[PDB]
Amino acid sequence: WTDQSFIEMMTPHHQDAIDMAEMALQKAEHPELKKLARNIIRDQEREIKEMKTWYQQWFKRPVPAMDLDALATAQNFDREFIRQMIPHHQMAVMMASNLKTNTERPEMDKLMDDIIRSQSAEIKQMKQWYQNWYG
C-alpha cells in the first residue's frame, strides 16, 4: 500500500463498516452490539474525514469514488453482524499494518496505530460475545 492507494481503498472499506453499524442501531439485539456500533460510526466517520482532508492536500484532488442484504434478512441479526464484521475488521488491521511499514507520513503512521488498536480490540470483543451468545 501507498498513502494514496490506502486512502482510496480504506475510505469505502470504512463506509461499509459504518453502513453495517448504522443498521445495528435499528436492529441489534444485544445492547453491547449497539454500543459497539456507535463507536464504529463515531471513530470511522472521523477517520474518513481525516483521510479526505489529507488526500486533497497531498494529491491536490478529491478521493476518487460485505452483504447488507444478508444482514437484513438474517434470523439473528447479531450473529450475522459479527460473522461479517470480524473478517472485515481483520482486513483493515492487515491493510493498516502494511501501510505502517510503507509510509513516511506522521499523519498516516498515527492513523494506522488507531485502526490497528481499536479494530483489534473490537475483534476481541465480538469473538467473545459470539461464544457467549452462540457457543
Side-chain angles (χ1 to χ4, degrees), residues 1-8 10-26 28-51 53-59 61-82 84-109 111-123 125-135:
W1 296 104
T2 62
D3 303 318
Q4 187 189 333
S5 70
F6 179 93
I7 288 168
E8 293 169 2
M10 187 59 64
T11 295
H13 197 267
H14 266 22
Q15 196 59 63
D16 281 346
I18 292 154
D19 290 352
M20 296 253 308
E22 283 286 348
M23 189 177 309
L25 295 191
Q26 279 296 325
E29 303 162 84
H30 296 89
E32 297 97 324
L33 205 55
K34 285 194 191 177
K35 180 171 165 46
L36 170 60
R38 288 186 288 269
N39 287 343
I40 287 174
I41 295 165
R42 180 196 67 239
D43 290 338
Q44 298 198 23
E45 284 188 341
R46 180 188 66 246
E47 296 175 348
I48 281 178
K49 174 62 178 172
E50 286 173 358
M51 287 190 290
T53 297
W54 299 335
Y55 191 99
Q56 178 155 293
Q57 290 173 1
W58 300 338
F59 315 111
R61 61 182 166 93
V63 179
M66 289 201 295
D67 193 344
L68 285 180
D69 173 53
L71 182 63
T73 58
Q75 169 63 28
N76 211 264
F77 183 88
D78 293 7
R79 186 170 192 151
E80 182 62 11
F81 179 98
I82 292 171
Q84 291 198 44
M85 188 72 69
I86 289 178
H88 195 265
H89 267 40
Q90 284 173 316
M91 179 62 176
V93 172
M94 290 167 79
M95 286 176 60
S97 304
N98 176 263
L99 186 275
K100 197 168 151 69
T101 71
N102 274 313
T103 191
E104 301 175 329
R105 306 185 177 271
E107 300 96 327
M108 296 300 275
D109 184 62
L111 175 64
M112 298 315 104
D113 286 339
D114 292 343
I115 295 178
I116 293 160
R117 176 178 53 255
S118 61
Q119 300 198 36
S120 293
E122 291 170 356
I123 292 157
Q125 287 184 295
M126 288 190 280
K127 280 184 185 282
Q128 187 60 59
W129 295 335
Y130 196 93
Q131 289 306 309
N132 290 359
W133 302 342
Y134 316 112

PDB file of all heavy atoms in Angstrom, residues 7 12 14 17 31 34 37 39 44-46 56 61 70 73 79 89-90 93-94 102 105-106 108 112 120-121 125 128:
ATOM      1  N   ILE A   7      -5.774   5.263   1.069  1.00  0.00           N
ATOM      2  CA  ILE A   7      -6.940   6.096   1.314  1.00  0.00           C
ATOM      3  C   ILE A   7      -8.083   5.750   0.361  1.00  0.00           C
ATOM      4  O   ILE A   7      -9.242   5.719   0.764  1.00  0.00           O
ATOM      5  CB  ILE A   7      -6.598   7.595   1.251  1.00  0.00           C
ATOM      6  CG1 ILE A   7      -5.777   7.971   2.497  1.00  0.00           C
ATOM      7  CG2 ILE A   7      -7.898   8.421   1.120  1.00  0.00           C
ATOM      8  CD1 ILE A   7      -5.105   9.365   2.450  1.00  0.00           C
ATOM      9  N   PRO A  12     -13.883   3.581   1.242  1.00  0.00           N
ATOM     10  CA  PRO A  12     -15.113   2.792   1.119  1.00  0.00           C
ATOM     11  C   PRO A  12     -15.163   1.590   2.064  1.00  0.00           C
ATOM     12  O   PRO A  12     -16.255   1.154   2.424  1.00  0.00           O
ATOM     13  CB  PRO A  12     -15.083   2.317  -0.335  1.00  0.00           C
ATOM     14  CG  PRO A  12     -13.642   2.371  -0.729  1.00  0.00           C
ATOM     15  CD  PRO A  12     -13.106   3.567  -0.014  1.00  0.00           C
ATOM     16  N   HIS A  14     -14.157   1.588   5.190  1.00  0.00           N
ATOM     17  CA  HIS A  14     -14.746   2.226   6.367  1.00  0.00           C
ATOM     18  C   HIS A  14     -16.240   2.496   6.183  1.00  0.00           C
ATOM     19  O   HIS A  14     -17.041   2.243   7.082  1.00  0.00           O
ATOM     20  CB  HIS A  14     -14.066   3.564   6.660  1.00  0.00           C
ATOM     21  CG  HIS A  14     -12.934   3.486   7.646  1.00  0.00           C
ATOM     22  ND1 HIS A  14     -12.241   2.324   7.905  1.00  0.00           N
ATOM     23  CD2 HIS A  14     -12.402   4.437   8.451  1.00  0.00           C
ATOM     24  CE1 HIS A  14     -11.311   2.567   8.819  1.00  0.00           C
ATOM     25  NE2 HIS A  14     -11.380   3.842   9.157  1.00  0.00           N
ATOM     26  N   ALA A  17     -18.330  -0.549   6.827  1.00  0.00           N
ATOM     27  CA  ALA A  17     -18.474  -0.831   8.253  1.00  0.00           C
ATOM     28  C   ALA A  17     -19.497   0.113   8.888  1.00  0.00           C
ATOM     29  O   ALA A  17     -20.330  -0.317   9.692  1.00  0.00           O
ATOM     30  CB  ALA A  17     -17.128  -0.729   8.960  1.00  0.00           C
ATOM     31  N   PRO A  31     -27.473  -5.039  23.790  1.00  0.00           N
ATOM     32  CA  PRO A  31     -27.042  -3.644  23.961  1.00  0.00           C
ATOM     33  C   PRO A  31     -25.534  -3.454  23.725  1.00  0.00           C
ATOM     34  O   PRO A  31     -25.118  -2.371  23.290  1.00  0.00           O
ATOM     35  CB  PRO A  31     -27.433  -3.335  25.417  1.00  0.00           C
ATOM     36  CG  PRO A  31     -27.543  -4.693  26.085  1.00  0.00           C
ATOM     37  CD  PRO A  31     -28.104  -5.577  25.011  1.00  0.00           C
ATOM     38  N   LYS A  34     -25.070  -2.667  20.056  1.00  0.00           N
ATOM     39  CA  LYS A  34     -25.412  -1.287  19.710  1.00  0.00           C
ATOM     40  C   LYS A  34     -24.330  -0.313  20.152  1.00  0.00           C
ATOM     41  O   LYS A  34     -24.019   0.649  19.448  1.00  0.00           O
ATOM     42  CB  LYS A  34     -26.741  -0.874  20.320  1.00  0.00           C
ATOM     43  CG  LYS A  34     -27.915  -1.468  19.622  1.00  0.00           C
ATOM     44  CD  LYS A  34     -29.193  -0.776  20.031  1.00  0.00           C
ATOM     45  CE  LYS A  34     -30.392  -1.559  19.537  1.00  0.00           C
ATOM     46  NZ  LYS A  34     -31.657  -0.937  19.982  1.00  0.00           N
ATOM     47  N   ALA A  37     -21.568  -0.516  17.770  1.00  0.00           N
ATOM     48  CA  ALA A  37     -21.998   0.179  16.554  1.00  0.00           C
ATOM     49  C   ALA A  37     -21.774   1.689  16.652  1.00  0.00           C
ATOM     50  O   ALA A  37     -21.233   2.308  15.725  1.00  0.00           O
ATOM     51  CB  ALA A  37     -23.445  -0.127  16.252  1.00  0.00           C
ATOM     52  N   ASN A  39     -19.663   3.294  18.478  1.00  0.00           N
ATOM     53  CA  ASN A  39     -18.235   3.567  18.468  1.00  0.00           C
ATOM     54  C   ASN A  39     -17.646   3.446  17.063  1.00  0.00           C
ATOM     55  O   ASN A  39     -16.853   4.299  16.628  1.00  0.00           O
ATOM     56  CB  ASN A  39     -17.514   2.663  19.470  1.00  0.00           C
ATOM     57  CG  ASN A  39     -17.779   3.069  20.904  1.00  0.00           C
ATOM     58  OD1 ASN A  39     -18.223   4.187  21.172  1.00  0.00           O
ATOM     59  ND2 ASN A  39     -17.504   2.166  21.837  1.00  0.00           N
ATOM     60  N   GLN A  44     -14.929   5.748  12.864  1.00  0.00           N
ATOM     61  CA  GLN A  44     -14.652   5.587  11.431  1.00  0.00           C
ATOM     62  C   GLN A  44     -15.141   6.752  10.569  1.00  0.00           C
ATOM     63  O   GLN A  44     -14.550   7.034   9.529  1.00  0.00           O
ATOM     64  CB  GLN A  44     -15.168   4.238  10.917  1.00  0.00           C
ATOM     65  CG  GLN A  44     -14.470   3.048  11.601  1.00  0.00           C
ATOM     66  CD  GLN A  44     -14.633   1.744  10.846  1.00  0.00           C
ATOM     67  OE1 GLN A  44     -14.886   1.730   9.639  1.00  0.00           O
ATOM     68  NE2 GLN A  44     -14.492   0.635  11.557  1.00  0.00           N
ATOM     69  N   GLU A  45     -16.199   7.436  10.992  1.00  0.00           N
ATOM     70  CA  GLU A  45     -16.582   8.669  10.302  1.00  0.00           C
ATOM     71  C   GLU A  45     -15.482   9.717  10.453  1.00  0.00           C
ATOM     72  O   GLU A  45     -15.133  10.411   9.489  1.00  0.00           O
ATOM     73  CB  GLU A  45     -17.940   9.198  10.788  1.00  0.00           C
ATOM     74  CG  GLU A  45     -19.105   8.414  10.222  1.00  0.00           C
ATOM     75  CD  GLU A  45     -20.458   9.028  10.518  1.00  0.00           C
ATOM     76  OE1 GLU A  45     -20.566   9.857  11.454  1.00  0.00           O
ATOM     77  OE2 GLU A  45     -21.425   8.666   9.809  1.00  0.00           O
ATOM     78  N   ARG A  46     -14.922   9.819  11.656  1.00  0.00           N
ATOM     79  CA  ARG A  46     -13.841  10.765  11.910  1.00  0.00           C
ATOM     80  C   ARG A  46     -12.624  10.452  11.031  1.00  0.00           C
ATOM     81  O   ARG A  46     -12.001  11.355  10.462  1.00  0.00           O
ATOM     82  CB  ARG A  46     -13.454  10.744  13.394  1.00  0.00           C
ATOM     83  CG  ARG A  46     -12.331  11.702  13.766  1.00  0.00           C
ATOM     84  CD  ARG A  46     -11.872  11.498  15.206  1.00  0.00           C
ATOM     85  NE  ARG A  46     -11.236  10.198  15.414  1.00  0.00           N
ATOM     86  CZ  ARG A  46     -11.738   9.228  16.176  1.00  0.00           C
ATOM     87  NH1 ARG A  46     -12.893   9.407  16.811  1.00  0.00           N
ATOM     88  NH2 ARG A  46     -11.090   8.075  16.304  1.00  0.00           N
ATOM     89  N   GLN A  56      -6.695  15.382  -0.320  1.00  0.00           N
ATOM     90  CA  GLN A  56      -6.754  16.557  -1.179  1.00  0.00           C
ATOM     91  C   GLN A  56      -5.526  17.458  -0.980  1.00  0.00           C
ATOM     92  O   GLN A  56      -5.042  18.062  -1.931  1.00  0.00           O
ATOM     93  CB  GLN A  56      -8.072  17.322  -1.023  1.00  0.00           C
ATOM     94  CG  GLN A  56      -8.087  18.585  -1.895  1.00  0.00           C
ATOM     95  CD  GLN A  56      -9.474  19.043  -2.278  1.00  0.00           C
ATOM     96  OE1 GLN A  56     -10.181  18.368  -3.033  1.00  0.00           O
ATOM     97  NE2 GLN A  56      -9.869  20.207  -1.767  1.00  0.00           N
ATOM     98  N   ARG A  61      -6.452  16.712  -5.348  1.00  0.00           N
ATOM     99  CA  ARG A  61      -7.736  16.360  -5.933  1.00  0.00           C
ATOM    100  C   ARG A  61      -8.515  15.538  -4.909  1.00  0.00           C
ATOM    101  O   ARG A  61      -7.933  15.062  -3.932  1.00  0.00           O
ATOM    102  CB  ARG A  61      -7.553  15.615  -7.265  1.00  0.00           C
ATOM    103  CG  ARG A  61      -6.799  14.307  -7.191  1.00  0.00           C
ATOM    104  CD  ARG A  61      -6.655  13.717  -8.591  1.00  0.00           C
ATOM    105  NE  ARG A  61      -5.664  12.644  -8.656  1.00  0.00           N
ATOM    106  CZ  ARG A  61      -5.950  11.353  -8.514  1.00  0.00           C
ATOM    107  NH1 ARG A  61      -7.201  10.967  -8.292  1.00  0.00           N
ATOM    108  NH2 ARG A  61      -4.986  10.445  -8.592  1.00  0.00           N
ATOM    109  N   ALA A  70     -27.897  -9.823   3.197  1.00  0.00           N
ATOM    110  CA  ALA A  70     -27.825 -10.999   4.054  1.00  0.00           C
ATOM    111  C   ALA A  70     -27.979 -10.617   5.517  1.00  0.00           C
ATOM    112  O   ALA A  70     -28.561 -11.359   6.301  1.00  0.00           O
ATOM    113  CB  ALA A  70     -26.520 -11.730   3.840  1.00  0.00           C
ATOM    114  N   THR A  73     -31.774  -9.762   6.380  1.00  0.00           N
ATOM    115  CA  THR A  73     -32.700 -10.884   6.299  1.00  0.00           C
ATOM    116  C   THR A  73     -32.362 -12.000   7.285  1.00  0.00           C
ATOM    117  O   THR A  73     -33.145 -12.927   7.466  1.00  0.00           O
ATOM    118  CB  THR A  73     -32.728 -11.480   4.876  1.00  0.00           C
ATOM    119  OG1 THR A  73     -31.410 -11.903   4.509  1.00  0.00           O
ATOM    120  CG2 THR A  73     -33.215 -10.442   3.871  1.00  0.00           C
ATOM    121  N   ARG A  79     -25.639 -12.259  15.254  1.00  0.00           N
ATOM    122  CA  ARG A  79     -24.798 -13.354  14.822  1.00  0.00           C
ATOM    123  C   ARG A  79     -24.241 -13.048  13.447  1.00  0.00           C
ATOM    124  O   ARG A  79     -23.047 -13.199  13.207  1.00  0.00           O
ATOM    125  CB  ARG A  79     -25.606 -14.650  14.773  1.00  0.00           C
ATOM    126  CG  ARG A  79     -24.757 -15.872  14.476  1.00  0.00           C
ATOM    127  CD  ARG A  79     -25.560 -17.152  14.687  1.00  0.00           C
ATOM    128  NE  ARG A  79     -24.680 -18.311  14.684  1.00  0.00           N
ATOM    129  CZ  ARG A  79     -24.921 -19.431  15.352  1.00  0.00           C
ATOM    130  NH1 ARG A  79     -26.025 -19.550  16.080  1.00  0.00           N
ATOM    131  NH2 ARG A  79     -24.051 -20.429  15.291  1.00  0.00           N
ATOM    132  N   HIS A  89     -13.043  -6.259   9.812  1.00  0.00           N
ATOM    133  CA  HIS A  89     -12.078  -5.658  10.739  1.00  0.00           C
ATOM    134  C   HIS A  89     -10.673  -6.222  10.534  1.00  0.00           C
ATOM    135  O   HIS A  89      -9.678  -5.500  10.573  1.00  0.00           O
ATOM    136  CB  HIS A  89     -12.502  -5.954  12.172  1.00  0.00           C
ATOM    137  CG  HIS A  89     -13.345  -4.884  12.787  1.00  0.00           C
ATOM    138  ND1 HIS A  89     -14.334  -4.218  12.095  1.00  0.00           N
ATOM    139  CD2 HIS A  89     -13.341  -4.362  14.036  1.00  0.00           C
ATOM    140  CE1 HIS A  89     -14.903  -3.330  12.892  1.00  0.00           C
ATOM    141  NE2 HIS A  89     -14.321  -3.399  14.075  1.00  0.00           N
ATOM    142  N   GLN A  90     -10.591  -7.527  10.341  1.00  0.00           N
ATOM    143  CA  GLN A  90      -9.290  -8.158  10.201  1.00  0.00           C
ATOM    144  C   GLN A  90      -8.576  -7.670   8.958  1.00  0.00           C
ATOM    145  O   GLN A  90      -7.368  -7.457   8.979  1.00  0.00           O
ATOM    146  CB  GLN A  90      -9.425  -9.682  10.214  1.00  0.00           C
ATOM    147  CG  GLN A  90      -9.663 -10.237  11.606  1.00  0.00           C
ATOM    148  CD  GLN A  90      -9.965 -11.709  11.579  1.00  0.00           C
ATOM    149  OE1 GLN A  90     -10.736 -12.174  10.743  1.00  0.00           O
ATOM    150  NE2 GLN A  90      -9.355 -12.458  12.485  1.00  0.00           N
ATOM    151  N   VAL A  93      -7.076  -4.193   9.786  1.00  0.00           N
ATOM    152  CA  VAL A  93      -5.874  -4.281  10.637  1.00  0.00           C
ATOM    153  C   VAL A  93      -4.685  -4.699   9.765  1.00  0.00           C
ATOM    154  O   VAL A  93      -3.572  -4.186   9.884  1.00  0.00           O
ATOM    155  CB  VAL A  93      -6.072  -5.288  11.793  1.00  0.00           C
ATOM    156  CG1 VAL A  93      -4.765  -5.516  12.559  1.00  0.00           C
ATOM    157  CG2 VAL A  93      -7.168  -4.790  12.726  1.00  0.00           C
ATOM    158  N   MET A  94      -4.975  -5.633   8.874  1.00  0.00           N
ATOM    159  CA  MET A  94      -3.944  -6.106   7.975  1.00  0.00           C
ATOM    160  C   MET A  94      -3.491  -5.040   6.975  1.00  0.00           C
ATOM    161  O   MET A  94      -2.271  -4.871   6.803  1.00  0.00           O
ATOM    162  CB  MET A  94      -4.371  -7.396   7.297  1.00  0.00           C
ATOM    163  CG  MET A  94      -4.424  -8.590   8.233  1.00  0.00           C
ATOM    164  SD  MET A  94      -5.296  -9.939   7.445  1.00  0.00           S
ATOM    165  CE  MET A  94      -4.048 -10.605   6.345  1.00  0.00           C
ATOM    166  N   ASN A 102       5.210   1.140   5.141  1.00  0.00           N
ATOM    167  CA  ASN A 102       5.466   1.778   3.850  1.00  0.00           C
ATOM    168  C   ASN A 102       5.499   3.307   3.895  1.00  0.00           C
ATOM    169  O   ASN A 102       6.210   3.953   3.109  1.00  0.00           O
ATOM    170  CB  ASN A 102       4.426   1.307   2.823  1.00  0.00           C
ATOM    171  CG  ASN A 102       4.832   0.020   2.140  1.00  0.00           C
ATOM    172  OD1 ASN A 102       5.979  -0.118   1.696  1.00  0.00           O
ATOM    173  ND2 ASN A 102       3.913  -0.940   2.069  1.00  0.00           N
ATOM    174  N   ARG A 105       4.663   9.364   6.457  1.00  0.00           N
ATOM    175  CA  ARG A 105       3.873  10.486   6.945  1.00  0.00           C
ATOM    176  C   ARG A 105       3.404  10.276   8.378  1.00  0.00           C
ATOM    177  O   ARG A 105       2.798   9.254   8.688  1.00  0.00           O
ATOM    178  CB  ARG A 105       2.665  10.713   6.042  1.00  0.00           C
ATOM    179  CG  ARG A 105       2.988  10.888   4.557  1.00  0.00           C
ATOM    180  CD  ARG A 105       1.717  11.234   3.794  1.00  0.00           C
ATOM    181  NE  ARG A 105       1.937  11.481   2.376  1.00  0.00           N
ATOM    182  CZ  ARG A 105       2.226  12.680   1.874  1.00  0.00           C
ATOM    183  NH1 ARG A 105       2.348  13.727   2.680  1.00  0.00           N
ATOM    184  NH2 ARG A 105       2.411  12.829   0.571  1.00  0.00           N
ATOM    185  N   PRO A 106       3.671  11.249   9.257  1.00  0.00           N
ATOM    186  CA  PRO A 106       3.231  11.114  10.648  1.00  0.00           C
ATOM    187  C   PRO A 106       1.702  10.993  10.755  1.00  0.00           C
ATOM    188  O   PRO A 106       1.215  10.278  11.635  1.00  0.00           O
ATOM    189  CB  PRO A 106       3.727  12.402  11.307  1.00  0.00           C
ATOM    190  CG  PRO A 106       3.968  13.354  10.175  1.00  0.00           C
ATOM    191  CD  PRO A 106       4.413  12.502   9.027  1.00  0.00           C
ATOM    192  N   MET A 108      -0.302   9.443   8.714  1.00  0.00           N
ATOM    193  CA  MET A 108      -0.692   8.075   8.403  1.00  0.00           C
ATOM    194  C   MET A 108      -0.198   7.103   9.468  1.00  0.00           C
ATOM    195  O   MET A 108      -0.894   6.142   9.812  1.00  0.00           O
ATOM    196  CB  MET A 108      -0.198   7.671   7.008  1.00  0.00           C
ATOM    197  CG  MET A 108      -0.838   8.493   5.868  1.00  0.00           C
ATOM    198  SD  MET A 108      -2.653   8.327   5.812  1.00  0.00           S
ATOM    199  CE  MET A 108      -2.817   6.829   4.834  1.00  0.00           C
ATOM    200  N   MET A 112      -2.744   4.626  11.373  1.00  0.00           N
ATOM    201  CA  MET A 112      -2.585   3.171  11.352  1.00  0.00           C
ATOM    202  C   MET A 112      -2.621   2.609  12.757  1.00  0.00           C
ATOM    203  O   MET A 112      -3.268   1.595  13.004  1.00  0.00           O
ATOM    204  CB  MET A 112      -1.288   2.745  10.660  1.00  0.00           C
ATOM    205  CG  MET A 112      -1.184   3.138   9.184  1.00  0.00           C
ATOM    206  SD  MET A 112      -2.664   2.841   8.186  1.00  0.00           S
ATOM    207  CE  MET A 112      -3.337   4.495   8.028  1.00  0.00           C
ATOM    208  N   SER A 120      -8.612  -4.136  16.443  1.00  0.00           N
ATOM    209  CA  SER A 120      -8.173  -5.369  17.088  1.00  0.00           C
ATOM    210  C   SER A 120      -8.948  -5.587  18.384  1.00  0.00           C
ATOM    211  O   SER A 120      -9.365  -6.706  18.669  1.00  0.00           O
ATOM    212  CB  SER A 120      -6.668  -5.367  17.362  1.00  0.00           C
ATOM    213  OG  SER A 120      -5.939  -5.385  16.149  1.00  0.00           O
ATOM    214  N   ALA A 121      -9.156  -4.521  19.159  1.00  0.00           N
ATOM    215  CA  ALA A 121      -9.912  -4.638  20.403  1.00  0.00           C
ATOM    216  C   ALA A 121     -11.367  -5.014  20.145  1.00  0.00           C
ATOM    217  O   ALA A 121     -11.989  -5.732  20.937  1.00  0.00           O
ATOM    218  CB  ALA A 121      -9.844  -3.354  21.196  1.00  0.00           C
ATOM    219  N   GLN A 125     -13.677  -8.338  21.281  1.00  0.00           N
ATOM    220  CA  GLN A 125     -14.998  -8.240  21.898  1.00  0.00           C
ATOM    221  C   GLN A 125     -16.026  -9.080  21.171  1.00  0.00           C
ATOM    222  O   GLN A 125     -16.782  -9.832  21.797  1.00  0.00           O
ATOM    223  CB  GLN A 125     -15.488  -6.797  21.913  1.00  0.00           C
ATOM    224  CG  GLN A 125     -14.791  -5.902  22.896  1.00  0.00           C
ATOM    225  CD  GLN A 125     -15.409  -4.520  22.901  1.00  0.00           C
ATOM    226  OE1 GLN A 125     -15.350  -3.803  21.907  1.00  0.00           O
ATOM    227  NE2 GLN A 125     -16.033  -4.154  24.012  1.00  0.00           N
ATOM    228  N   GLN A 128     -15.639 -12.821  21.697  1.00  0.00           N
ATOM    229  CA  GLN A 128     -16.135 -13.262  22.998  1.00  0.00           C
ATOM    230  C   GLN A 128     -17.667 -13.255  23.066  1.00  0.00           C
ATOM    231  O   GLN A 128     -18.272 -14.205  23.574  1.00  0.00           O
ATOM    232  CB  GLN A 128     -15.555 -12.429  24.137  1.00  0.00           C
ATOM    233  CG  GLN A 128     -15.921 -12.983  25.500  1.00  0.00           C
ATOM    234  CD  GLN A 128     -15.413 -14.405  25.701  1.00  0.00           C
ATOM    235  OE1 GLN A 128     -14.210 -14.662  25.617  1.00  0.00           O
ATOM    236  NE2 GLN A 128     -16.328 -15.335  25.951  1.00  0.00           N
TER     237      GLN A 128
END
